[PDB]
Amino acid sequence: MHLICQSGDVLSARYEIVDTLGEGAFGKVVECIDHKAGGRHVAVKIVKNVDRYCEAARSEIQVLEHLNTTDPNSTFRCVQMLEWFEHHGHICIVFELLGLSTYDFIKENGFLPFRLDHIRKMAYQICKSVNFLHSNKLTHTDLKPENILFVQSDYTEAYNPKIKRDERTLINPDIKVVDFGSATYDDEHHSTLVSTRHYRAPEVILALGWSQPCDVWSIGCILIEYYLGFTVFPTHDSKEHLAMMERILGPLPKHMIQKTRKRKYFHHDRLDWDEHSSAGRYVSRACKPLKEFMLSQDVEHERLFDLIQKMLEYDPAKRITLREALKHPFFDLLKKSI
Numbered sequence: 169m170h171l172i173c174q175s176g177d178v179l180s181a182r183y184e185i186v187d188t189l190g191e192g193a194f195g196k197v198v199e200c201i202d203h204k205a206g207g208r209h210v211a212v213k214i215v216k217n218v219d220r221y222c223e224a225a226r227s228e229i230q231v232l233e234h235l236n237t238t239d240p241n242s243t244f245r246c247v248q249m250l251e252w253f254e255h256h257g258h259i260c261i262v263f264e265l266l267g268l269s270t271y272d273f274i275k276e277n278g279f280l281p282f283r284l285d286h287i288r289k290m291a292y293q294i295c296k297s298v299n300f301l302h303s304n305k306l307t308h309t310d311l312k313p314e315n316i317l318f319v320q321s322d323y324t325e326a327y328n329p330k331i332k333r334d335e336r337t338l339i340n341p342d343i344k345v346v347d348f349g350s351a352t353y354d355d356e357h358h359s360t361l362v363s364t365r366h367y368r369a370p371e372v373i374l375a376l377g378w379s380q381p382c383d384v385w386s387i388g389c390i391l392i393e394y395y396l397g398f399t400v401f402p403t404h405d406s407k408e409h410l411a412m413m414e415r416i417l418g419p420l421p422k423h424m425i426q427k428t429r430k431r432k433y434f435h436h437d438r439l440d441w442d443e444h445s446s447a448g449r450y451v452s453r454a455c456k457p458l459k460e461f462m463l464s465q466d467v468e469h470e471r472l473f474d475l476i477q478k479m480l481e482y483d484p485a486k487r488i489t490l491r492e493a494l495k496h497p498f499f500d501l502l503k504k505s506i
């Protein structure tokens with residue numbers, strides 16, 4: 169796909185490529201000048217010409233047509249799709265241009281976490297956006313910091329002596345949600361596997377059936393990452409991930425081990441887990457109870473951790489909904505009267 173385009177090329181007789189914004193297994197996103205919209209800069213996702221990504225792209229176009237007509241002012245912060253077309257047999261989707269992902273920001277900030285005031289604002293907007301999907305019988309299923317994009321990524325920089333780090337701070341942390349190629353309607357077939365290892369809910373790993381609550385799980389994991397700069401589940405292995413969940417959040421509920429067909433993770437009613445193995449020693453060093461990750465015992469940190477704990481409830485029915493999350497005390501500060 170280096171083959172099919174480059175800087176200076178004009179796509180669909182109107183979109184002049186001026187930059188490549190990023191690349192992925194999924195394809196790439198380029199920045200274009202739209203010569204038929206007064207020179208508006210747009211993002212064009214150019215989809216890898218592979219069955220999986222083609223199918224996801226057609227699905228994304230259908231979901232965004234739905235969300236974007238349902239919410240034409242983008243009150244709920246889903247990215248606006250402008251149109252789509254084909255280029256050398258690749259699907260190309262045109263979006264309003266957004267800045268870099270929250271992942272890429274953290275990376276470019278030397279994996280320093282966001283300060284709590286920005287986490288509060290971003291968390292509220294993510295919950296509100298993803299709650300709009302949940303209001304429209306949709307589950308995103310692949311939420312991650314890479315899929316949350318800043319509207320504008322201008323920042324200030326200052327030495328912080330506390331951590332002896334130069335630190336970037338966004339001027340405006342407003343976000344939009346992207347990547348609707350895995351989004352699943354309530355009445356559609358639910359894939360066995362959904363989500364990216366570090367954000368997968370326990371009911372997904374244990375194949376107990378998933379729906380909107382698996383997005384809540386993902387968002388709790390995203391907020392921990394925002395807070396720390398790193399995932400608290402640093403693994404790609406499902407069984408190790410369960411072992412990390414057990415160290416950070418406590419024992420899996422007996423009713424989830426009882427029901428699961430994923431007997432390969434278990435020995436009787438316990439995780440089939442050797443604490444003394446390489447992976448066992450890594451899990452014991454790397455993981456600890458959730459509240460031990462708090463950087464401050466200040467009440468605003470307790471409030472965030474209270475919300476994260478509710479989002480990381482194992483039972484997906486008990487798990488806080490995003491409608492309830494938007495009412496959580498952590499967001500009181502956002503509701504202080506002007």
Ligand SMILES: CCOc1ccc2c(-c3ccnc(Nc4cc(OC)cc(C(F)(F)F)c4)n3)cnn2n1
Pocket residue numbers: 189190191192194196197198211213247263264265266267268269314315317346347
């Ligand atoms: C796994 C994630 O997949 C993505 C990722 C980004 C998108 C977009 C999008 C829509 C509007 N504006 C942008 N801007 C953008 C800006 C960047 O730096 C300034 C970097 C990137 C990137 F290429 F790395 F993704 C994108 N991206 C639409 N769909 N997706 N699907």
